[PDB]
Design a binder for these strands. Structure first.
Ligand SMILES: [Mg+2]
Ligand SMILES: [Mg+2]
Ligand SMILES: [Mg+2]
Ligand SMILES: [Mg+2]
Ligand SMILES: [Mg+2]
Ligand SMILES: [Mg+2]
Ligand SMILES: [Mg+2]
Ligand SMILES: [Mg+2]
Ligand SMILES: [Mg+2]
Ligand SMILES: [Mg+2]
Ligand SMILES: [Mg+2]
Ligand SMILES: [Mg+2]
Ligand SMILES: [Mg+2]
Ligand SMILES: [Mg+2]
Ligand SMILES: [Mg+2]
Ligand SMILES: [Mg+2]
Ligand SMILES: [Mg+2]
Ligand SMILES: [Mg+2]
Ligand SMILES: [Mg+2]
Ligand SMILES: [Mg+2]
Ligand SMILES: [Mg+2]
Ligand SMILES: [Mg+2]
Ligand SMILES: [Mg+2]
Ligand SMILES: [Mg+2]
Ligand SMILES: [Mg+2]
Ligand SMILES: [Mg+2]
Ligand SMILES: [Mg+2]
Ligand SMILES: [Mg+2]
Ligand SMILES: [Mg+2]
Ligand SMILES: [Mg+2]
Ligand SMILES: [Mg+2]
Ligand SMILES: [Mg+2]
Ligand SMILES: [Mg+2]
Ligand SMILES: [Mg+2]
Ligand SMILES: [Mg+2]
Ligand SMILES: [Mg+2]
Ligand SMILES: [Mg+2]
Ligand SMILES: [Mg+2]
Ligand SMILES: [Mg+2]
Ligand SMILES: [Mg+2]
Ligand SMILES: [Mg+2]
Ligand SMILES: [Mg+2]
Ligand SMILES: [Mg+2]
Ligand SMILES: [Mg+2]
Ligand SMILES: [Mg+2]
Ligand SMILES: [Mg+2]
Ligand SMILES: [Mg+2]
Ligand SMILES: [Mg+2]
Ligand SMILES: [Mg+2]
Ligand SMILES: [Mg+2]
Ligand SMILES: [Mg+2]
Ligand SMILES: [Mg+2]
Ligand SMILES: [Mg+2]
Ligand SMILES: [Mg+2]
Ligand SMILES: [Mg+2]
Ligand SMILES: [Mg+2]
Ligand SMILES: [Mg+2]
Ligand SMILES: [Mg+2]
Ligand SMILES: [Mg+2]
Ligand SMILES: [Mg+2]
Ligand SMILES: [Mg+2]
Ligand SMILES: [Mg+2]
Ligand SMILES: [Mg+2]
Ligand SMILES: [Mg+2]
Ligand SMILES: [Mg+2]
Ligand SMILES: [Mg+2]
Ligand SMILES: [Mg+2]
Ligand SMILES: [Mg+2]
Ligand SMILES: [Mg+2]
Ligand SMILES: [Mg+2]
Ligand SMILES: [Mg+2]
Ligand SMILES: [Mg+2]
Ligand SMILES: [Mg+2]
Ligand SMILES: [Mg+2]
Ligand SMILES: [Mg+2]
Ligand SMILES: [Mg+2]
Ligand SMILES: [Mg+2]
Ligand SMILES: [Mg+2]
Ligand SMILES: [Mg+2]
Ligand SMILES: [Mg+2]
Ligand SMILES: [Mg+2]
Ligand SMILES: [Mg+2]
Ligand SMILES: [Mg+2]
Ligand SMILES: [Mg+2]
Ligand SMILES: [Mg+2]
Ligand SMILES: [Mg+2]
Ligand SMILES: [Mg+2]
Ligand SMILES: [Mg+2]
Ligand SMILES: [Mg+2]
Ligand SMILES: [Mg+2]
Ligand SMILES: [Mg+2]
Ligand SMILES: [Mg+2]
Ligand SMILES: [Mg+2]
Ligand SMILES: [Mg+2]
Ligand SMILES: [Mg+2]
Ligand SMILES: [Mg+2]
Ligand SMILES: [Mg+2]
Ligand SMILES: [Mg+2]
Ligand SMILES: [Mg+2]
Ligand SMILES: [Mg+2]
Ligand SMILES: [Mg+2]
Ligand SMILES: [Mg+2]
Ligand SMILES: [Mg+2]
Ligand SMILES: [Mg+2]
Ligand SMILES: [Mg+2]
Ligand SMILES: [Mg+2]
Ligand SMILES: [Mg+2]
Ligand SMILES: [Mg+2]
Ligand SMILES: [Mg+2]
Ligand SMILES: [Mg+2]
Ligand SMILES: [Mg+2]
Ligand SMILES: [Mg+2]
Ligand SMILES: [Mg+2]
Ligand SMILES: [Mg+2]
Ligand SMILES: [Mg+2]
Lengths: 46, 271
RNA sequence: CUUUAAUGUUUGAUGUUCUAACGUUGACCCGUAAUCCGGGUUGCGGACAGUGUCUGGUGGGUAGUUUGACUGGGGCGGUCU
RNA sequence: AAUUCCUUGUCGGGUAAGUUCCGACCUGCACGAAUGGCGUAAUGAUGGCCAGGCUGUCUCCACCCGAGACUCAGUGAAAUU
RNA sequence: GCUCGCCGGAAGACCAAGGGUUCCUGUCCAACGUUAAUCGGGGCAGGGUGAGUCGACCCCUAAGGCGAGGCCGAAAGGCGUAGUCGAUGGGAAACAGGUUAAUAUUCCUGUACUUGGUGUUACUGCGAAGGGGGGACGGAGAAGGCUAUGUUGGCCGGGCGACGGUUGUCCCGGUUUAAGCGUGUAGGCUGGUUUUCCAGGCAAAUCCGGAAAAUCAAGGCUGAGGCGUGAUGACGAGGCACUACGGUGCUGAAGCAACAAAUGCCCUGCUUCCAGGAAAAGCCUCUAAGCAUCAGGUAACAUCAAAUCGUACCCCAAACCGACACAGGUGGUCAGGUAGAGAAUACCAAGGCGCUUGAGAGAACUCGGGUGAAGGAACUAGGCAAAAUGGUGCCGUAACUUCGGGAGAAGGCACGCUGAUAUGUAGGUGAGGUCCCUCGCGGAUGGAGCUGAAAUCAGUCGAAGAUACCAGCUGGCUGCAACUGUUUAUUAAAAACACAGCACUGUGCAAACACGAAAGUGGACGUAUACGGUGUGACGCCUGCCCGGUGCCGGAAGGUUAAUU
RNA sequence: AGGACCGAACCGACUAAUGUUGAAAAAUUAGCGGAUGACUUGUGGCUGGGGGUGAAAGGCCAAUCAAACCGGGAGAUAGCU
């Protein structure tokens, strides 16, 4: 029974990472929404 | 030489293959190869634009001399080879100064022959001349449309063009579709027909034999749902519609050519 | 006034020719170490093609919607002043 | 008849007895020639029918081997009201 | 601790992804563990990961991403040139033994190798953002030579057996050794050498390509394994002394041969087929600009440097994805013995486990199995389930057929053990010895030793000899679809979809068509024997009448007809 | 030679029984189909919601599909309970 979540660090960073949020105009507004909300962690990069 | 295969298997029963024993068996010429990759019918937007493409064997690209540009230097044919990128064969020629090139193989060309290009060449197959110097009525292939551009007409296997009439600065040609076209007489053309005239006698034989050529299955429009194809829908086999394309245009009888810039070069259409 | 020819104005249409607008996914040189782009020499088309405004036709390819009530359950039949 | 309502049409074969099956008739409610017509060797976890072997499927059930069910010690739910 | 049972192509061992202290030691039993707990992957404290050679980093590129200028677009932004990123691919180098509670190709012992920097000496023309070579490449098949490994014999050490026999043709154990260096073997590919010239490689070339002569015929490249050395070493049965009954230290015999043998290596080889099978750098070579007592290049010796990050542990799972200590899922590697065609199957080796509730009893009923008198589908929607056949060799085999098939059609006979032919046969492999030799990992001859099916004849045991596990039920008529294939992840696998084949129709290349306000891109680096759309669906015999209706194609004499004036 | 034949690994999913507050939000056990190819598999990449992809079932697009999920218009409207 294969599941939907198959982990991979390389493809997690290439999609939801910080350097991928800041490349597009709509991805930088995600960070501005999470900075205004007050999130301890902005992106997945750890 | 078409050879029918014996029916030792259901998929081998109807196969007819064309075999040429004079083709080179080893590897092709290294300096004249390149790299091309499959596309799958997708364009730079990522979407499918041409349907029923994808898969197949891997191929290389061979640089063929479509211009036949160097003049006054004879060449001698060395071998006939198999080109996966086209239905005709090719021939590797060696020029007198020591330069090698790939050309289309005319019908009746064999290793040891002589070829020549320019305005002072003889009228023998495989020679390239401007159409001012070619007698009216000759059968030619690899025809040009603009002087210096390169050959564009009659490049498949067994095709040719017929020189019908010369009128000043224009020569009239009969294309394989039975269409009359005027072309500037400065354009070049190669004498003779194209080889591999037996190409059309082959029979693939099985479904898998077409997947080796990157062709994917075609689904009939009437087998889909109404949302998909204008032909879709039905409880049983109901059609009751005028046949059309998947996008809603008459698929039978309706002309689609709309070009007004180059109608002055067409004498009469194929009909 | 009718039927009519002639000198002369208004031009409407039909071809032919030309090159300077315009096109070139023909060849060559330079920026330049570059099959994009730009500039120049040349050949070929040429007031055609094409684009903007207005306009007649076609247009389930797409969109928004309509498709009545009574009724010994609803439809069919009948009815509505 | 993957099509035939009436219909389990009528005749023959197979069964002691056959609304299913095989072969024919034509009266085709409402087959028919690339929304293909009629055949067709091989192929099929394809639909229907008949035989040989085989048997607890059955006449009609009987005994035996293990896991629960039952009693004892420890832990300890649920729908519903 | 002694017995019992289970897995053993895994339920053993090692990598990768993923996780992150679960690793080791001391200590505790509140909560966690489907029960108790002195135990734990639980609580608290301390300890543990050592690299010039393994991986990352680094040089180079594929698909693809971004993109100075640039083209386009109400704005945001889209595409793209020069460039620059991007492995799942290409590029230099290390092996054996010992050691810790926990790390080791990293530490220690022995023996090695690679790439640069500087210095000395000796010869000499060096030089790229450029040319050429190479790197560099498919599927299938077959044979030969080897190795890993295994069996047996010899050798060494030990034993003389709880119950009949066991000084022998008896029993148990061991018989191990690497990278590196020299040799260039089975075998594979290939003609070498010297002069002259050229419209080619964007200029140049002595390099590659081409052309014309003369001379010699063997030159060169690649290559498993074996042998010598590494190694007078390390390892090793066992014995000996204590013990803080965990273990410490010393010594240490033999360490050979034959036969069988891979899916691994020679092999990126050879043969053959059509569907015709990546790029760039590292590397070799050639010159241009420039320098020419210089800088540079080659060689011998000395010496320096190789930084930074990962390294514990989970080994197809109690630590990863499934809410769980969940009968599920997870890429690659290794591959012992007997029987066997086998990586199936049965029993075992190395190794690992008995699945975190037990003790009784021996009711109905439920689940998984074993056997059954006479009958044999009478059951039932339906032979659903169950029962039955099942191997090798030989004999034999119908209609029909597209001549391949049908066909393993159907059906039948033999099968164990012992003896002889033959104190072990045909065959396989092969040491001495003899001769020759361009002398070597050589050639011929020779046959000791080792291994060894299959058959025939005779005898013999049982109810049964393919004795267990394993392992087709068969035949006759008929509808549908030619066939292999695809499909409703999770109630439908089919007659539905596809298919090779056929026909109509559009397209002359800045092609028709499709994604796109556009620039562009696919079609295609293709050119009517090509590409797109539609229907039918192998093959055989064929495809008849209708243009009134709807649709489409061609023509423009006449009527009506928009903006415009 | 073979979209060839029998059959393990590997890929699937035709029948029956159990399970159905399951060991499991699709499995287990016994048989079953393909198994050199239209095959299967690791890593990375590309196509985005009136859109993609589809050997075509209205199938699949993170246990969600005759139009995904999140946030907003928004306290939509509700002659109805
Ligand atoms: Mg792109
Ligand atoms: Mg087709
Ligand atoms: Mg459908
Ligand atoms: Mg429609
Ligand atoms: Mg119908
Ligand atoms: Mg109709
Ligand atoms: Mg002109
Ligand atoms: Mg104009
Ligand atoms: Mg106009
Ligand atoms: Mg509508
Ligand atoms: Mg509305
Ligand atoms: Mg009403
Ligand atoms: Mg009523
Ligand atoms: Mg009836
Ligand atoms: Mg009768
Ligand atoms: Mg009966
Ligand atoms: Mg009767
Ligand atoms: Mg009966
Ligand atoms: Mg009857
Ligand atoms: Mg019946
Ligand atoms: Mg009948
Ligand atoms: Mg009849
Ligand atoms: Mg009729
Ligand atoms: Mg019909
Ligand atoms: Mg018809
Ligand atoms: Mg049909
Ligand atoms: Mg028929
Ligand atoms: Mg049949
Ligand atoms: Mg099938
Ligand atoms: Mg049947
Ligand atoms: Mg019968
Ligand atoms: Mg019977
Ligand atoms: Mg019986
Ligand atoms: Mg009973
Ligand atoms: Mg139980
Ligand atoms: Mg409660
Ligand atoms: Mg066992
Ligand atoms: Mg097994
Ligand atoms: Mg890790
Ligand atoms: Mg912890
Ligand atoms: Mg502890
Ligand atoms: Mg207690
Ligand atoms: Mg407890
Ligand atoms: Mg702990
Ligand atoms: Mg390394
Ligand atoms: Mg990196
Ligand atoms: Mg790129
Ligand atoms: Mg870009
Ligand atoms: Mg820019
Ligand atoms: Mg790079
Ligand atoms: Mg890599
Ligand atoms: Mg490498
Ligand atoms: Mg070291
Ligand atoms: Mg300790
Ligand atoms: Mg360890
Ligand atoms: Mg070591
Ligand atoms: Mg060391
Ligand atoms: Mg040490
Ligand atoms: Mg180069
Ligand atoms: Mg490679
Ligand atoms: Mg080959
Ligand atoms: Mg050996
Ligand atoms: Mg005794
Ligand atoms: Mg005794
Ligand atoms: Mg022994
Ligand atoms: Mg020994
Ligand atoms: Mg040799
Ligand atoms: Mg280079
Ligand atoms: Mg480790
Ligand atoms: Mg692991
Ligand atoms: Mg394991
Ligand atoms: Mg447990
Ligand atoms: Mg588990
Ligand atoms: Mg074994
Ligand atoms: Mg067997
Ligand atoms: Mg019982
Ligand atoms: Mg029972
Ligand atoms: Mg009985
Ligand atoms: Mg009995
Ligand atoms: Mg009996
Ligand atoms: Mg019987
Ligand atoms: Mg009956
Ligand atoms: Mg009955
Ligand atoms: Mg059955
Ligand atoms: Mg059975
Ligand atoms: Mg038959
Ligand atoms: Mg079977
Ligand atoms: Mg019937
Ligand atoms: Mg079929
Ligand atoms: Mg499926
Ligand atoms: Mg289903
Ligand atoms: Mg034809
Ligand atoms: Mg045509
Ligand atoms: Mg059809
Ligand atoms: Mg037909
Ligand atoms: Mg007709
Ligand atoms: Mg008509
Ligand atoms: Mg008419
Ligand atoms: Mg008309
Ligand atoms: Mg096959
Ligand atoms: Mg089969
Ligand atoms: Mg099979
Ligand atoms: Mg089987
Ligand atoms: Mg099913
Ligand atoms: Mg079922
Ligand atoms: Mg199977
Ligand atoms: Mg199964
Ligand atoms: Mg992936
Ligand atoms: Mg869509
Ligand atoms: Mg699509
Ligand atoms: Mg439907
Ligand atoms: Mg909607
Ligand atoms: Mg809201
Ligand atoms: Mg509300
Ligand atoms: Mg509002």
């Amino acid at each position: 029974m294969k599941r939907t979540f198959q982990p991979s660090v390389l493809k997690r960073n290439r999609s939801h990472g910080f350097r991928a949020r800041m490349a597009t105009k709509n991805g930088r507004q995600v960070l501005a929404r999470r900075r205004a909300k007050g999130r301890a962690r902005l992106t997945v990069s750890k | 030489a078409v050879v029918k295969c014996k029916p030792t298997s259901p998929g081998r029963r109807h196969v007819v293959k064309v075999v040429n024993p004079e083709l080179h068996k080893g590897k092709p010429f290294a300096p004249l190869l390149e790299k091309n990759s499959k596309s799958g019918g997708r364009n730079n937007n990522g979407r499918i634009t041409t349907r029923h493409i994808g898969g197949g064997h891997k191929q290389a690209y061979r640089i063929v001399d479509f211009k036949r540009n160097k003049d006054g230097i004879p060449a001698v044919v060395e071998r006939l080879e198999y080109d996966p990128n086209r239905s005709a064969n090719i021939a590797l020629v060696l020029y007198k100064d020591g330069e090698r090139r790939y050309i289309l193989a005319p019908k009746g060309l064999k290793a040891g022959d002589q070829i020549q290009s320019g305005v002072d060449a003889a009228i023998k197959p495989g020679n390239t001349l401007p159409m001012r110097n070619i007698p009216v009525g000759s059968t030619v292939h690899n025809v040009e449309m603009k002087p210096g551009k390169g050959g564009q007409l009659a490049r498949s296997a067994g095709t040719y063009v017929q020189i019908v009439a010369r009128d000043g600065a224009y020569v009239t040609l009969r294309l394989r579709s039975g269409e009359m076209r005027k072309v500037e007489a400065d354009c070049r053309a190669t004498l003779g027909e194209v080889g591999n005239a037996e190409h059309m006698l082959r029979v693939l034989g099985k479904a898998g034999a077409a997947r080796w050529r990157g062709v994917r299955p075609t689904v009939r429009g009437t087998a889909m749902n109404p949302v998909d194809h204008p032909h879709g829908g039905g409880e049983g086999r109901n059609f009751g519609k005028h046949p059309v394309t998947p996008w809603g245009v008459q698929t039978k009888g309706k002309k689609t050519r709309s070009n007004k810039r180059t109608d002055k070069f067409i004498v009469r259409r194929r009909s």
